[PDB]
Structures are given as structure tokens and as C-alpha cells.
Amino acid sequence: TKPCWYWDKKDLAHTPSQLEGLDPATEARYRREGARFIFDVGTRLGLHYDTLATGIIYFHRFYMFHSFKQFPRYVTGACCLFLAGKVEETPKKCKDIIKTARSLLNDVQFGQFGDDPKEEVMVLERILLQTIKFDLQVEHPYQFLLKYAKQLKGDKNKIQKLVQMAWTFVNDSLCTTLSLQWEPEIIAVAVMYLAGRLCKFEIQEWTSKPRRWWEQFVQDVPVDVLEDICHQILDLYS
């Protein structure tokens, strides 16, 4: 009864947007624009980091079954955030999300909302709920970043700096389809592996003994997996 919410990179190269003729870099920017729209809107309303991430996860999954050439990105983004508030028990009125959405977008960007932006978001809630198969509960790499870093004993300033850079990497990872690739536990260790290389830190010295320090947090995670997640996060800065 629990559906599978992960795709290969070959499956991610054949999204409904690509089949309808959209460019891969254009879809990747649509996901960036849309995910960072649910991000900017959510903070202005004072929403919680799981609530923003849940709306973004709904957003990336919605466009595995629908193409951007049929569903505007920002209307879907505002709809996903509106649904994420109820599921995460931090509900915001749709009227506030649109009054906020109008305050951050253009005249042509907000033009996707039509003459009645409220209803245009309301009718999409039915499409989104069926698209997410009513699998409302999701986990984000934030909780695993804190959960795994708690078991690290060592320099308090170096460990605290580690989770500070990995946290922003979890923010940046939400603009990519990494959510549709690896479980939240894989992303949490990936941002710790990445942040440990940029700080010149040796994480295993804060664990037991020396070493693949994450084999005690996540099962069977080859390094090639973690270095692939790091690439897609670092590419956001290119």
C-alpha cells in the first residue's frame, strides 16, 4: 500500500516534461524556480523547516506525473505548500499564501494564477492529492542530520560548524531531484560527508576508532553514492 517514490537518473531523464519536448536544463530551472518559491513564501509566513520541505517534495513528485507545459510551476508550488501546512500541522490560509505569492512574483509570474488565483490553487489540490497517492507523511534529511550528529563526540565548535554547513546543503538539495533519488537518511549523511571535506574535517575521529564512518548510521552506502549526491549539490553553485 506504500508506493515507491524514487526514480533512476534514466527515469529522471524521461519526465513528462521531457516527453512533451521541454529541455532538461529548462525543467531543472523550473524545479529550482518552483522549489525556491515554496521556500520564499514559507519563511515570510513563518513556516517550519519540515513544512517547507514537505511542500517542495510534493512539488518534485507532482512533476513526475505531470509536465510543466500543462501545469504552471508557481500555482502548483503554492498548492503544495498549502497542503504541506495541513499535513505538518502548521496550516496557513490559502488567501495568505497568495497575498504572499503576489508580493514575491512578477506581473507575468503571478499571471499563471489567472483571474481567481485562490480557486486556481483550490482545484489543483485534488489533482495533487491523487498524484501523491495520498501518501502525505514524509521524512526530511534535517531530522537525520541532527540525529546522526548527536552521536559525534569531539570538538564542539567543529561539530557545530559541520551541521551548520550540512544544514544549508539540505536547503540547496531541495532545489534538485535528490529528493526523488535517495532516502532522507542518504541525503543527511551526504551533506555531512560533503561538509566534512570542505572543512578539512575527519568525521571518523568523532566516532569509534580511526573508516567509513557512516556505516553505523546507514546500511550499505557505497562512497560513489555519496560523491554523486555531493556533485549535484555543488553544481548549484556553478
Binding site: 508506493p3 483550490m122 489540490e125 485534488r126 497517492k133
Partner: protein, 311 residues
């Protein structure tokens, strides 16, 4: 898995089962297999905030709970509008059965009923979930003899290692700590309501029948003794302890007003109807009582459950 895509036209509405929070409950049958189902209509056409957060709550709780004694949500269906929540069809509820007068439950029946109910509640409690709406109407019984727990819309997660809403259970099954204003309560509110229905299965009438909270508190205190620091040292911390007090300091007389029920059943009822929730029975140890220790369900028989009512 892929839920929400199938249409309601695959079902035929037989009749109206009841009226839930989001809509009416419909008895329906599958046009493809013949399975009876219960459909909960969740309207969103007119709602101001789209899909009700109350139904979203009920959805993401029931999709974490899989158990023989918990109603399983089969699927979700639309129309082409609104959505319908598909549940496994149960044949009866215990309230409708007792109010009819056509059913008589033996202690062999009550032991089987309590073993399934306490087994399902222990599963929900082990997952850190309060039901917060246990009553006779929400206990569903099959003609095969299977017991199930239903209507999880008011169920909430519980902090195992924080405060919640005070008044949550219908008054006839609400524990004394909520009447006195407790807001950081425990699963012990659920094992209390089950105490009220354990006694109700031997009386066909709810144990504590009042309409106001104060008029309720004295009714329990007339049976279980008045809440005092001697048997419940934390009464002095609940808000309305002094504002809402019984007429006199009654003595517990549960072991005699229910002297007709079996000893093992009376010993379990006393442990489940204790005033102090810190001293109240745990759902796990309710199945370790002398009344439910050696009750193998496969060696039981379904009860006298009727099939038609002037409904």
C-alpha cells in the same frame, strides 16, 4: 498503493451507515468483486480551506496503523466533486447492539471482545498513539466475531519520552483527570474508556451517564470514590480540583456494585477504573489479567448477533 485514482462508480451505494465529521457514512458494495465496504464522503467543493485537515489527520494516522483489531483503510476514491474513504465493512457496532436488547454477551464473549480491543489498543499505544474517542459506538463487531477499533480522526500522537486538548472523549467515557482540567494527559485516558465499556458489556447501559462535567465527576466518585490525595496524590495539581468537587468524600464501592460480574472480570475492572492515572492499568497488562490471560480466540464462537433491525 496508488490511492485516489479509482472512481466511486466502481461501488454502488446501498444505504447510509451514519454521519461522521466530514460527511455521511455509506454502505456500499464493490461492483467488481462483491465486497461490502464503508465509504466516508469527504467534501471539498464548498470548504473554505480545501481538503479538511481533520480528514488529513485521520488519513495519515490510519496509514501508520496495521492491525487485526484496527479498521483498515482499503483505498481512497473520487468521483467524476469529493473523495471517499474506503474502509473494510463491519457488520455491527457495540452501541447499536446493546441498545437493541436482542443480544446477550456471555463472559466468554466479553473476554474475546476485550482481548481483541486491548490487543488493538496496545498496538496503538506501542506506536505512541492515543485514540481519544473510545466509546461503544466506535467499537465495531463482525458476524465472524472480530472486534475492531474505528474513527481515528481524533487520535493523536503521544510524547513518549507535552500538552494536548482537554475535553476529547464523550462525557460518558471521559476519565476524571480530563474533567478536572488535565492537559498533558497519557494513554491512560484510553484504558479508562475501555473500563467503561467492560462494565457496559455486563450492564447494557453506560456506567457513568451524565450530561455536565461536574454532574459526571460526582457520578464516578459515587462509584470509584471521590478523588483525594490519599489514593491519587496529584489531584491537588489539576486545575478544577477545588472548583469542581463532589458533594461528599465518597468511598470506593466498585467491588460490590459490580459483585455480580466474575471475580477475574471484577479484578480487571477495578484496575482499569482507578482514579489515579499513574495507578491505572496499562493496555499491555490488561491482557495479562486473570480475565484475559488464557483466552485463545481460535477456540471461541461468534455471539447471537442479529441481522435486521427496525433501523
Amino acid at each position: 498503493s496508488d490511492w485516489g485514482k479509482r472512481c466511486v462508480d466502481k461501488f454502488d451505494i446501498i444505504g447510509i451507515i451514519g454521519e461522521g465529521t466530514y460527511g455521511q457514512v455509506y454502505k456500499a458494495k464493490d461492483k467488481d468483486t462483491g465486497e461490502l465496504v464503508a465509504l466516508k464522503k469527504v467534501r471539498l467543493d464548498n470548504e473554505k480551506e480545501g481538503f479538511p485537515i481533520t480528514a488529513i489527520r485521520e488519513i495519515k494516522i490510519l496509514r501508520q496503523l496495521i492491525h487485526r483489531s484496527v479498521v483498515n483503510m482499503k483505498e481512497i476514491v473520487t468521483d467524476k466533486g469529493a473523495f471517499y474513504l474506503v474502509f473494510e465493512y463491519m457488520d455491527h457496532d457495540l452501541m447499536g447492539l446493546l441498545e437493541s436488547g436482542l443480544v446477550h454477551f456471555s463472559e466468554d464473549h466479553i473476554k474475546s471482545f476485550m482481548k481483541q480491543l486491548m490487543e488493538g489498543l496496545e498496538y496503538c499505544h506501542k506506536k505512541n498513539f492515543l485514540h481519544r474517542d473510545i466509546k461503544c459506538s466506535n467499537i465495531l463487531l463482525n458476524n465472524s466475531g472480530q472486534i475492531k477499533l474505528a474513527d481515528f480522526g481524533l487520535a493523536r500522537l503521544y510524547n513518549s519520552e507535552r500538552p494536548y486538548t482537554n475535553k476529547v472523549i464523550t462525557l460518558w467515557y471521559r476519565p476524571p483527570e480530563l474533567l478536572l482540567g488535565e492537559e498533558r494527559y497519557t494513554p491512560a485516558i484510553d484504558v479508562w474508556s475501555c473500563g467503561c465499556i467492560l462494565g457496559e458489556l455486563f450492564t447494557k447501559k453506560p456506567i457513568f451517564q451524565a450530561n455536565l462535567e461536574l454532574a459526571q465527576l460526582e457520578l464516578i466518585s459515587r462509584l470509584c470514590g471521590s478523588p483525594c490525595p490519599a489514593v491519587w496524590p496529584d489531584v491537588i495539581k489539576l486545575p478544577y480540583f477545588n472548583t469542581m468537587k463532589p458533594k461528599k468524600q465518597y468511598r470506593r464501592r466498585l467491588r460490590e456494585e459490580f459483585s455480580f460480574i466474575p471475580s477475574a472480570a471484577l479484578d480487571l475492572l477495578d484496575h482499569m477504573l482507578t482514579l489515579d492515572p499513574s495507578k491505572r492499568c496499562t493496555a499491555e497488562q490488561t491482557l495479562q489479567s486473570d480475565f484475559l490471560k488464557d483466552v485463545e480466540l481460535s477456540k471461541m464462537a461468534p455471539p447471537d448477533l442479529p441481522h435486521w433491525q427496525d433501523c
